[PDB]
Amino acid sequence: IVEGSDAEIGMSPWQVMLFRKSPQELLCGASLISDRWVLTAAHCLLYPPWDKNFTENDLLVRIGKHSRTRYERNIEKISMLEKIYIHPRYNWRENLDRDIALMKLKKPVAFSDYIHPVCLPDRETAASLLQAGYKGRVTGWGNLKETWTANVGGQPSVLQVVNLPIVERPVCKDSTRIRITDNMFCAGYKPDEGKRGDACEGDSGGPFVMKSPFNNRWYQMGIVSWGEGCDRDGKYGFYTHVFRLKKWIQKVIDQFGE
Amino acid sequence: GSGEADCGLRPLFEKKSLEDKTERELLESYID
Amino acid sequence: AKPR
Ligand SMILES: *[C@@H]1O[C@H](CO)[C@@H](O)[C@H](O)[C@H]1NC(C)=O
Ligand code: NA
């Protein structure tokens, strides 16, 4: 996260870390949406340009973490993966269209002060909160600045958080040459808006969330998907439109129990 | 206990009627 | 494409 700040304890209890077993590194962010279902970007699991094609056994997830580095004794939890599900119409060749994937935990995780699922948006919530100018929240353990390894196959000690405004669709389109689809939205400040902030390398797959004024519940509206660099003037972060792919999500989940 | 029944309500915040340092900023954007 |  660029130009964000230290998250508070338990501020984002649905935050999930995606790890490679061997060699041991942090790959992507993710989110807990039930006691056994984790949500992330498809390109975290499958991206052929970078020889990326992780199976279940390659990965484990860490839930309820705050520090990137230190072990949190009776706070954080290590979960294994039973099955990986990537959107069948996911398109990595062109624009990361439908950049979304579900991961099922081998065993259900137990909820705590630090581990708790985020809500999936319904139409009403999606209709109300998905408006330009309205702000959502992005969290992750990614880089604090854009590095030379960006968009190619320092770092915070604790979880980072930034709030960013949803951007008007035509502005998003004019900011990039990539064909954007309505399975995406983009967020971030405009050059003359003064404020700054963006997701960065390692924040991929993490949650873009918004708090409903109607029921005080946090809803995940987006997944950190792609962006040209980090926190560049005139560029914006692009996010997987969760509600527009919710039908797929539910279909996967209903066949193997939430 | 499976998820969706109490989802989105944080134990250390919503449950305890406490707000985080910046959630205000979000609500302001939804109103103003 | 282009993921960070
Ligand atoms: C991904 O790798 C698995 C084995 O790890 C292989 O069976 C599968 O064909 C690959 N899929 C793609 C889309 O490359
Ligand atoms: Na920007």
Residue numbers in the entry:
A (entry chain H): 321 to 473, 475 to 579
B (entry chain L): 287 to 318
C (entry chain M): 51 to 54
Paper text:
Two isoforms of a thrombin inhibitor, madanin-1 and madanin-2, sharing 79% amino acid sequence identity, were identified in salivary gland cDNA libraries of H. longicornis ticks. Given the lack of sequence similarity to other inhibitors, madanins were classified as a distinct family - family I53 - of the MEROPS database. Madanins display two clusters of acidic residues in the N-terminal two thirds of their amino acid sequence, conferring on them an overall acidic character (theoretical pI of 4.84 and 4.50 for madanin-1 and madanin-2, respectively). Here we show that inhibitors of MEROPS family I53 are hydrolysed by the blood coagulation factors α-thrombin and factor Xa.
Finally, the crystallographic three-dimensional structure of the complex between human α-thrombin and a madanin-1 fragment elucidated the molecular details of madanin-1 recognition and processing by the proteinase. Finally, circular dichroism spectra of recombinant madanin-1 and madanin-2 are characteristic of “random-coils” suggesting that both molecules are intrinsically disordered in solution. In striking contrast to a previous report, we found that under low ionic strength conditions (50 mM NaCl), madanin-1 and madanin-2 compete with a small synthetic chromogenic substrate (Tos-Gly-Pro-Arg-p-nitroanilide) for binding to the active site of thrombin, inhibiting the enzyme in a dose-dependent manner. Furthermore, both recombinant madanins display anticoagulant activity in vitro, as indicated by the dose-dependent prolongation of thrombin time (TT). When thrombin and madanin-1 or madanin-2 were mixed in equimolar amounts (lane 1) formation of a single species with a slightly different migration profile from thrombin alone (lane 5) was observed, suggesting the formation of a 1∶1 thrombin·madanin complex. However, bands migrating faster than free madanin were observed when a molar excess of the inhibitor was used (lanes 2–4), indicating possible processing of madanins by thrombin. Altogether, these results suggest cleavage of madanins by thrombin at least at one site. N-terminal sequencing and mass spectrometry analysis of the madanin-1 and madanin-2 hydrolysis products, following separation by reverse-phase HPLC, allowed the identification of the thrombin cleavage sites. For madanin-1, three fragments could be identified: fragment 1, corresponding to madanin-1 residues 1-21; fragment 2, corresponding to residues 22–54; and fragment 3, corresponding to the C-terminal peptide of the inhibitor (residues 55–60). In contrast to the also thrombin-cleavable variegin, the inhibitory activity of madanins is lost after the cleavage reaction takes place.
